[PDB]
Design a protein. Structure first.
Ligand SMILES: C[As](C)(=O)[O-]
Ligand SMILES: C[As](C)(=O)[O-]
Ligand SMILES: C[As](C)(=O)[O-]
Ligand SMILES: C[As](C)(=O)[O-]
Ligand SMILES: C[As](C)(=O)[O-]
Ligand SMILES: C[As](C)(=O)[O-]
Ligand SMILES: C[As](C)(=O)[O-]
Ligand SMILES: C[As](C)(=O)[O-]
Ligand SMILES: [Mg+2]
Lengths: 241, 4, 239, 4
């Protein structure tokens, strides 16, 4: 048993990174526009491309369209890929995100990549990154003082914020979380173990605060991200040969 | 800053 | 910005580790006894004691009693502690675990330790470990081809991913606690804690239901899942 | 082996 064991990332391709970018919504949902989400989209495209990913992006897909795209990707062979990345940039609440016209439960999307549903990703990291609100709590600032495999294994769920909370987005620079994630990917993405990198992102985002707000009660509010690992090995994105 |  | 920053673990005390150990349940909940759970309790007690924790166990508490005890602990000062650990060994489903007589939502327990509610743990790891089922799915085997947020610095360590059954051997204890304890014994005092939990993920993922009265359940599986809101590297070097 |  080797504590240092890493996923094998020596396939022909790094893999696909999908980005679902949601800026506007069907009017009946009365959801505010997400100005600045395009900065996130571009930032992620740059940083994930630099790590070898084939980045694909889609703007404001309706739920039916999004579900179709996601099904298609879970159906193609990932046999010659190291891993799979899927990013959602949208509104959300509870355990769901919004497509243009309706909410989708996040489990509906991840389920399509479980081992029995997607054989060609078995044993490979399946990474989901979600920038979206997760409820209506606004975090407050405080100060100190050989074997078979489970079909559920090797997922990494990376959320911009802990369960139940608002997540923050700058209208020009993009979201707090995606900015900090991309900064870390840019500097450390090709060397640092990815959960270590996500931990640095937790620290970066935790340092931010709402500096100005039309609602004075929101001034100084906070956000801590949260990632869930079902990974079984160390994960790196060393430059591919 | 806006809320998501 | 230091990419290698570690939590300060040089306080007078490591901290408290609570273990809520549930073997039997009020008859009307129609829950089976959990043989092997006191083995988990003793195993954890040994490993966490070895890492410097002050371990306190409570057995088959009713919900009211459990809530009282957790509130009590969240109220006492942890100023001179490195961190706090809280373990639940029980049945569960959805987002709850069972006390003797009733379910408790996990968020009810963790909320008491958020920064605004427990000032003396602000900036310190708050580690929850939950051995319990989380739904009615039985995983199948496959083969390969600055201020701080009040929500920060939690680490939620689940024996299994969301929605799934978790497994317990009637003599040796649960898969997850056995493997967690084995890894604590070997690596607890040296490796980064999330790195160690990842090893646990691999260990548990290697296990399978080798024998079962229900033939359909033979070979079924389990992957654990940990959620980190940690902001630094976490080590338990000898104090 | 039992189910939790
Ligand atoms: C929608 As984007 C530029
Ligand atoms: C920016 As995408 C294809
Ligand atoms: C956070 As301001 C509107
Ligand atoms: C609990 As969060 C990923
Ligand atoms: C009976 As006890 C381990
Ligand atoms: C077994 As008790 C501390
Ligand atoms: C898992 As057998 C009864
Ligand atoms: C999603 As599990 C901690
Ligand atoms: Mg302030």
């Amino acid at each position: 048993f080797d504590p240092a064991e890493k996923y094998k990332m020596d396939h022909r391709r790094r893999g696909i990174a999908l980005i679902f970018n949601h800026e506007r919504f069907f009017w009946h949902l009365t959801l505010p526009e997400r100005r600045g989400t395009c900065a996130d989209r571009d930032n992620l495209t740059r940083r994930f491309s630099d790590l070898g990913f084939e980045v694909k992006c889609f703007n404001d897909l309706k739920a039916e369209e999004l579900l179709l795209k996601i099904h298609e990707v879970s159906t193609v062979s990932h046999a010659d890929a190291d891993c799979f990345v899927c990013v959602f940039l949208s509104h959300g609440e509870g355990n769901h995100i919004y497509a243009y016209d309706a909410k989708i439960e996040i489990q509906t999307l991840t389920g399509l990549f479980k081992g029995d549903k997607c054989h060609s990703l078995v044993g490979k990291p399946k990474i989901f990154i979600i920038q979206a609100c997760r409820g209506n709590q606004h975090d407050v600032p405080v100060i100190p003082l050989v074997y078979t495999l489970p079909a559920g294994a090797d997922f990494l769920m990376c959320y911009s914020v802990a369960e139940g909370y608002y997540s923050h987005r700058e209208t020009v620079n993009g979201s707090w979380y995606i900015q900090d994630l991309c900064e870390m990917l840019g500097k450390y993405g090709s060397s640092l173990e990815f959960t270590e990198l996500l931990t640095l992102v937790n620290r970066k985002v935790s340092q931010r605060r709402v500096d100005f707000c039309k609602d004075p009660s929101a001034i100084g509010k906070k956000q801590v991200p949260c990632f869930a690992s079902m990974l079984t090995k160390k994960l790196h994105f060393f430059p591919k040969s | 800053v806006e809320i998501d």
